[PDB]
């Protein structure tokens, strides 16, 4: 009964399938007039005693800011005549799905391209003073045309320059050492550790460090990256003792390419301060040697 020029009813879209496999209500839908495929994410009002979720406001704000080829596109926000939906341009695939598919096969050239787009997306978001905080293969989308998009900004937050950000961030398997050690003054290096885990996953076809608890995760990390030492990580003194860095040895099998192994090793660095950034990662010889990065058709 009230005018609403700038918030269309979600009924303009026709639900095709529930795709919310990782906990809320996510649907693939079709624009009833043009056939344009979209993803509808319902904003959950379960146990919301403070009106419109401050958590949803944050994500919407972030999605509205981030406009880039390698970042998921928020088209608009729809109502239902009472719920609210985030509407995104639909991407057919997700890296977790593609990697778990035995029929799917990547060449070295394509893996280079995937990593390039991912790192270019991170350079952009961080440049815009945003932390993704939920890096995982399932949040890396790929269009029909082979364009990678960073998705799910539900845990993302803006950062600046002693910060007290939430530690309870990032899925365990992709969580960096800093966070597991109790860091609240963290920045872009957290997303880059996630990039490292995903990069290695492009060959192993499976998450490299599958812990059951934070302690199990920290132990797994030590068996791979060496042990947490004030020598290795200056001032970490604020676990396993004998462990030596085996990043290149344990992945030596799957990867094969020298450059790929060197970059992964620079991404999975313990000290966040010593961990490679998106800019230097993009400059890495991995992207500038033969076979040169190529377009996606696999």
């Amino acid at each position: 009964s009230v005018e609403c020029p700038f918030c269309d009813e979600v009924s303009k879209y026709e639900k095709l399938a529930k795709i919310g496999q990782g906990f809320g209500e996510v649907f693939k839908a079709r624009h009833r007039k043009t056939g344009q495929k979209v993803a509808l994410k319902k904003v959950l009002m379960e146990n919301e005693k403070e009106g419109f979720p401050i958590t949803a406001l944050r994500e919407i704000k972030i999605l509205q800011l981030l406009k880039h080829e390698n970042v998921v596109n928020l088209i608009e926000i729809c109502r239902t005549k009472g719920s609210i939906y985030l509407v995104f341009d639909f991407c057919e695939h997700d890296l977790a799905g593609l990697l778990s598919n035995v029929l799917v096969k990547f060449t070295l050239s394509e893996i280079k391209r995937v990593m390039q787009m991912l790192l270019n997306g991170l350079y952009y978001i961080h440049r815009n003073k945003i932390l993704h905080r939920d890096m995982k293969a399932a949040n890396v989308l790929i269009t029909r045309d082979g364009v990678l998009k960073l998705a799910d900004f539900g845990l993302a937050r803006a950062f600046s320059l002693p910060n007290r950000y939430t530690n309870r961030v990032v899925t365990l398997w992709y969580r960096p050492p800093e966070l597991l050690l109790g860091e609240r003054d963290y920045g872009p290096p957290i997303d880059l550790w996630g990039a490292g885990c995903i990069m290695a996953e492009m060959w192993t076809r499976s998450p490299i460090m599958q812990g059951n608890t934070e302690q199990h995760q920290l132990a797994l990390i030590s068996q791979l990256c060496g042990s947490i030492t004030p020598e290795v990580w200056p001032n970490v003194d604020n676990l396993v003792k004998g462990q030596k860095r085996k990043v290149k040895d344990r992945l030596k099998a799957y990867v094969r390419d020298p450059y790929a192994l060197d970059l992964i090793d620079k991404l999975l660095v313990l000290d966040p301060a010593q961990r490679i950034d998106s800019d230097d990662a993009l400059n890495h010889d991995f992207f500038w040697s033969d076979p040169m990065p190529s377009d996606l058709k696999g």
Partner: protein, 252 residues
Amino acid sequence: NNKRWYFTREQLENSPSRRFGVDPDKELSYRQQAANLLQDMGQRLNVSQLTINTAIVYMHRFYMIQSFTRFPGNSVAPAALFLAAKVEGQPKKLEHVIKVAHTCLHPQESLPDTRSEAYLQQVQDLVILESIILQTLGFELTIDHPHTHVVKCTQLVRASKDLAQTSYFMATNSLHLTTFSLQYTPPVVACVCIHLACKWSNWEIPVSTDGKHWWEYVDATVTLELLDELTHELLQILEKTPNRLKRIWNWR
């Protein structure tokens, strides 16, 4: 759109409230009262002037779509502020905003029992109104204020603390007293504030070494003709506001 929330003078004459018979002058007062209510509640809730300013823009914009005849300012202001405090990272609890809105609007009345149906309904009414605000604004909540651009000018003019403080005063009062936020971009409004603060303090910003005026370094669209027209308009409403100019008046 980049010009979705910017309106012509004709668009401002034919407002949603005008359609329901509200005279232009009346609507301007309804806006001024909402801004005053937002300031009052905001100070009591201990939120920043930034949060208050954001809620004022939500109010201004909301009423370019909705009418004061269907949505009274006394209803919208609390919901607008509740939303702005969340957006600006100063979240205040719903029961807290209701407690404060009530004392501002009913100084002598007593807050109902938090167990009553009357109270549970006013809690629901705020949540419903926040939702109507979000939908009216099409979820575009990131506001840019002239204040951000005043900082830039006051350095690139080497303004006294006094001149800078007077310019922020102008910026805030432009939100309470005018519809500039619906017509001019924040950098333009910032130029208007610096120009009036200068005129008021008898401060003259000299012409740059290049032959350019100070505002040309802030916004290409800005002209002296516009600045004088807008400073005149802002000054007129300021003179009509009891005790406002007294705040910046040199009494020595």
